[PDB]
């Protein structure tokens, strides 16, 4: 429904209870994720659903993050979405093909951020509504029962690196977009640069951002020679 | 059958042919693993089975490591266990759901330490008797045909890191306890500290030890802010 | 059909359109991979098929890399192979058990170098014709849409490390040979030494080479003590 590959790699969360920021987010980013989940406080989600209806963005360049499968919030989200022109939703805590299928006929970006989602990543990616896979390090660690996703130097811990590769491979195996996880340390531009360069080098399509200042960094970040090495060179020229 | 989550994170192997050490092991550790497998020489396993019957420990805080599926030793182990109050066994070289199921009605901690076990980790974790997943680096490398699990600096080699993450994710996907592998270099307290801190940070529930001096180390070892980051902070306070 | 484990660990690609080099490749390496795929230009593949028939090597120590499943080149390759004594083929871009099975009654070394192949590695390894698993970092990154498989220091990027471990585990779970990926930087002998030492330490059986100068490097590259640690020591003595 959307030509997401035609849009650039800089995607930006915007909490949907801040409609006064929607235009700025759309001007700053390649794709805006209007957020009904963790970016919006529980008490503000009804107001976010009204803003979703009242302040429209370009549906060719906007995705809506709904709430998790089986929640009453998700039911309210889908009702609010009915009166919009949006076609593509982002499903947080995505944990099964069935959770993706129950969102048909919408296009779905599955955000894997739990152990069950990682174990089921291939089944989630293969589901007919899926158009992209994302991963989320902080909810992954939280639901695992841990306390940090990164070492002292800022490098991802191993289980986070493992899920990152899992999602990239599952997405690419089924022709889906691959979206890399957000860099929560906004002022850590050095770390974001290295992370987005790393993501682009292995074939992520998108780095998702939580602050508009990260979008320029992402956009900029994105012997024997045999056939694949020449493809690497062509990908660079492109 | 056991409230294993209620016990602390410091689990300690004690070879079952050393009953004179059982009381000391129970006083030193949160949970004792009385070992009928690799901790006991082949010729001493019959004596270990008698000690298992004769010198009981608290079954709320003691697990018995039996021998691998299909071995005559495992058959002897289960016969010896019949006359004990233990309910929970640790299955080494765990390689299929069927190996776990044939131990019903016992509770099972599956110790994955072979390639087949890693490939089948999700099926093993989902098996109805499973209450925990552990991994073992040295038997993993041995059965792969290799010669060391760690680099010169003591860091795990990549296939070991891969299986570690595999077991953590499979355990957590099915609500099982996650047990991190033993640190064979007993006097390497620095390495154990970093390893157990790493394990606790990503949500392992337990670090298993092979010497009681490791238990204190383990017990001690265990921007944009969104919902999961606050859960990280709560997990720390707890 | 071949006692591949009896041969040493140094395998060497030789483009099949260079029959004047076949004898030198056989003398330099433990096993020669006569290449009909990426080592030979599209326009030279018919000449490579004739050289395959005309200049035979020892079939106990020679494997033929054919072209990918579903290609017209692969059909031509199998026709050319009919008039040879070779029994074992290497399948590039191996992506399903069905691709391996359609090569029966030949023995197959599946070369996984795409996301779909990584996701399906266990099914590929378990296929009845499979005798080995290899992985390929450059085609993996190319087909993912990325631009490099290695960081600036030459270390593999994470998705490459992930697929490497995936292939080692899948191969070993089903009793197959495990072949480590080629080191394209031929003059980087230091990096190859560390890489092949790493591969041998975790139980790869083979490091595949693209230049004969790499074969000597590969051949040379290949506390509590419990049962598996003694197996590590025995593997070293052997
Ligand atoms: Mg999240
Ligand atoms: Mg073991
Ligand atoms: Mg290739």
Contacts of C198 (CB under 8 A, 6+ apart): B157, B158
The answer to whether C146 and A196 have CB atoms below 8 angstroms apart is no
The answer to whether C122 and C143 have CB atoms below 8 angstroms apart is no
H helix runs in C83-134, sequence order:
97-101, 115-119, 121-126
Closest CA to C75 of C103, C94, C48: C103
C-alpha–C-alpha distance, residues B31 and C109, integer Å: 46
Which among B169, B227, B229 is the nearest to A115, CB-wise? B169
Closest CA to C64 of C43, C96, C41, C91: C91
CB atoms < 10 A from the CB of A154, how many?
Answer: 14
Residue B194, CA distances (Å) to A214, B29, B190 in order: 32, 20, 6
C-alpha–C-alpha distance, residues B141 and A50, integer Å: 57
Longest C-alpha distance within chain B, in Å?
Answer: 60
C-alpha–C-alpha distance, residues A160 and A113, integer Å: 10
The answer to whether C92 and C111 have CB atoms below 8 angstroms apart is yes
Residue A113, annotated as binding a ligand: yes
Whether residues B162 and A163 touch (CB distance < 8 A) is answered with no
B137 C-alpha to center of ligand 2: Å?
8
Nearest ligand to residue C35 Cα: 3
Residue B206, CA distances (Å) to A73, A141, B177 in order: 35, 16, 8
C-alpha–C-alpha distance, residues A145 and A162, integer Å: 17
Residues from C contacting A (CB-CB < 8 Å) are 38-39, 113-116, 118-120, 136, 138-139, 141-148, 157-163, 182, 184-188, 210-211
Strands, DSSP E only, in C92-218? 107-112, 130-135, 177-180, 206-209
Chain B nearest CA to C51, separation (Å): 37
Architecture in CATH of C4-237? Alpha-Beta Barrel (3.20)
The answer to whether A77 and A49 have CB atoms below 8 angstroms apart is yes
Closest CA to C179 of C28, C30, C68: C30
Angle (CA) B146-B149-B150 rounded to 5° is: 130
Whether residues A227 and C148 touch (CB distance < 8 A) is answered with no
Closest CA to B149 of A117, C165, A199, C207: C165
**In chain C, what residues touch A194 (CB-CB under 8 Å)?**
none
Sign of CA dihedral A74, A78, A81, A85: positive
A183 C-alpha to center of ligand 1: Å?
12
B157 C-alpha to center of ligand 3: Å?
25
Residue A205, CA distances (Å) to A201, A202, B234, C32, C165 in order: 10, 9, 34, 38, 24
Chain A nearest CA to B225, separation (Å): 7
Closest CA to C157 of A195, A133, A183: A195
**In chain B, what residues touch C9 (CB-CB under 8 Å)?**
none
Contacts of A127 (CB under 8 A, 6+ apart): A97, A100, A101, A108, A110
Q: List the single residue in A with minimal CA-CA distance to B176.
A: A144
CB atoms < 10 A from the CB of A68, how many?
Answer: 19
Whether residues B146 and C224 touch (CB distance < 8 A) is answered with no
Spell out a b/e string for A119-128, using b for 16 or more CB atoms within 10 Å of the CB, else e: bbbbbbbbbe
Closest CA to A86 of A14, A2, A178: A2
Contacts of A72 (CB under 8 A, 6+ apart): none
Q: List the single residue in A with minimal CA-CA distance to C113.
A: A228
Nearest ligand to residue B35 Cα: 2
Q: List the single residue in B with minimal CA-CA distance to A15.
A: B226
C-alpha–C-alpha distance, residues A110 and A108, integer Å: 6
CB atoms < 10 A from the CB of C72, how many?
Answer: 8
Mutate to test the interface with C, among B112, B124, B138 (most CBs of C within 10 A): B138
Which among B164, B173, B201 is the nearest to A147, CB-wise? B201
Closest CA to C37 of C69, C1, C7: C69
Strands, DSSP E only, in A52-196? 62-65, 88-91, 107-112, 130-135, 177-180
**In chain A, what residues touch C148 (CB-CB under 8 Å)?**
201, 232
C-alpha–C-alpha distance, residues A32 and A83, integer Å: 19
**In chain B, what residues touch C236 (CB-CB under 8 Å)?**
147
Asked if omega into A105 is within 30° of 0 (cis), the reply is yes
- Phi, psi (5° rounding) for residue C95? -130, -5
C-alpha–C-alpha distance, residues A22 and A16, integer Å: 8
How many Cβ pairs within 8 Å bridge chains A and B?
Answer: 102
Please name the chains neighbouring C, where neighbouring means 3+ C-beta pairs under 8 angstroms: A, B
**Which one-letter DSSP state was computed for residue C5?**
G
3-state secondary structure of C212: coil
Which among C171, C198, C224 is the nearest to B184, CB-wise? C224
Which among C201, C205, C224 is the nearest to B157, CB-wise? C201
Technique used to solve these coordinates? X-ray
Closest CA to B11 of B147, B163, B132, B151: B132
Angle (CA) B128-B129-B135 rounded to 5° is: 110
C-alpha–C-alpha distance, residues B183 and A235, integer Å: 44
Closest CA to C52 of C80, C11, C32: C80
Nearest ligand to residue B33 Cα: 2
**In chain B, what residues touch C180 (CB-CB under 8 Å)?**
none
C-alpha–C-alpha distance, residues A109 and A133, integer Å: 6
Which among C116, C144, C210 is the nearest to A202, CB-wise? C144
**In chain C, what residues touch B40 (CB-CB under 8 Å)?**
none
C-alpha–C-alpha distance, residues B39 and B136, integer Å: 14
Whether residues C147 and A122 touch (CB distance < 8 A) is answered with no
Whether residues B202 and A141 touch (CB distance < 8 A) is answered with yes
3-state secondary structure of A63: strand
B68 C-alpha to center of ligand 2: Å?
10
Contacts of A194 (CB under 8 A, 6+ apart): none
C-alpha–C-alpha distance, residues C89 and B216, integer Å: 55
C-alpha–C-alpha distance, residues C76 and C99, integer Å: 16
C214 C-alpha to center of ligand 2: Å?
35
Whether residues B144 and C236 touch (CB distance < 8 A) is answered with no
CB atoms < 10 A from the CB of C44, how many?
Answer: 16
Domain parsing of chain C, residue ranges:
4-237
**In chain A, what residues touch C115 (CB-CB under 8 Å)?**
168-173
Chain B nearest CA to A43, separation (Å): 14
Q: Quick one: C6 exposed, middle or buried, by C-beta within 10 A (0-12, 13-18, 19+)?
A: exposed
Residue B4, CA distances (Å) to B59, B82, B176, B179, B205 in order: 11, 21, 10, 11, 10
Q: List the single residue in B with minimal CA-CA distance to A96.
A: B173
């Amino acid at each position: 429904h959307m030509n997401l590959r035609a849009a650039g790699p800089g995607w930006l969360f915007c909490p949907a209870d801040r409609p006064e920021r929607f235009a700025k987010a759309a001007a700053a980013a390649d794709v805006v994720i209007l957020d009904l989940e963790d970016g919006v406080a529980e008490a503000q989600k009804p107001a976010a659903r009204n803003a979703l209806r009242d302040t429209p963005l370009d549906p060719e360049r906007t995705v809506v993050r709904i709430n998790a499968g089986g929640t009453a919030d998700q039911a309210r989200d889908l009702e609010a979405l009915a009166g919009t022109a949006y076609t593509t939703v982002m499903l947080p805590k995505a944990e099964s093909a069935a959770q993706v299928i129950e969102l048909a006929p919408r296009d779905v970006i599955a955000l894997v951020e739990t152990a069950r989602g990682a174990v089921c990543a291939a089944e989630i990616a293969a589901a007919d509504p899926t158009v992209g896979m994302m991963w989320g390090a902080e909810d992954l660690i939280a639901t695992l029962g841990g306390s940090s996703s990164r070492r002292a130097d800022g490098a991802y811990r191993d289980v986070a690196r493992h899920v990152r590769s899992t999602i990239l491979l599952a997405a690419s195996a089924f022709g889906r977009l691959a979206l890399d996880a957000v860099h929560l340390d906004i002022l850590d531009v050095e770390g974001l640069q290295e992370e987005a360069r790393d993501a682009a080098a292995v074939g992520f399509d998108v780095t998702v951002c939580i602050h508009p200042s990260q979008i320029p960094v992402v956009r900029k970040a994105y012997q024997m020679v045999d056939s694949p090495v020449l493809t690497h060179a062509e990908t660079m020229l492109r």
